[PDB]
């Protein structure tokens with residue numbers, strides 16, 4: 001596991017084309033599962049049967065996603081461990097994430113665009 005910006009950790013699980021990497025502003029199609037540090041699952045889009053899309057690195061998602069995702073190539077599966085300051089910090093999210101939580105994200109880069 002690699003320690004990227006802000007102390008976010010990447011655990012590579014299954015490779016991508018090792019060549020198609022998301023660039024700033026690129027639209028990404030991802031499948032994620034979010035868990036707290038205890039393993040307690042709080043969200044998943046796989047459960048929704050619909051992948052998430054956002055433009056990467058422009059402030060649309062929490063910073064751990066912004067620093068994290070661009071280091072993945074199309075088709076890869078990896079796990080992002082994100083500390084509070086790079087996620088929801090001291091505020092959290094009502095009914096999902098408590099103040100100061102470290103978030104674990106299992107994500108799959110389906111397509112870059």
Ligand SMILES: C=CC[C@@H]1/C=C(\C)C[C@H](C)C[C@H](OC)[C@H]2O[C@@](O)(C(=O)C(=O)N3CCCC[C@H]3C(=O)O[C@H](/C(C)=C/[C@@H]3CC[C@@H](O)[C@H](OC)C3)[C@H](C)[C@@H](O)CC1=O)[C@H](C)C[C@@H]2OC
Pocket residue numbers: 032034042043044052060061062065087088089093096097
């Ligand atoms: C108003 C319209 C609702 C709009 C909802 C959608 C488009 C649907 C989309 C599937 C979101 C999920 O809803 C099904 C749901 O995703 C979580 O469950 C989740 O796993 C998560 O953490 N995600 C989602 C995947 C990207 C990383 C992170 C994120 O960065 O998400 C972003 C996030 C909340 C950023 C805040 C931005 C404000 C800053 O202040 C804060 O700064 C700390 C960080 C999302 C993408 C916002 O851009 C847009 C929205 O919120 C949140 C725990 C609760 C959130 O509910 C909404």
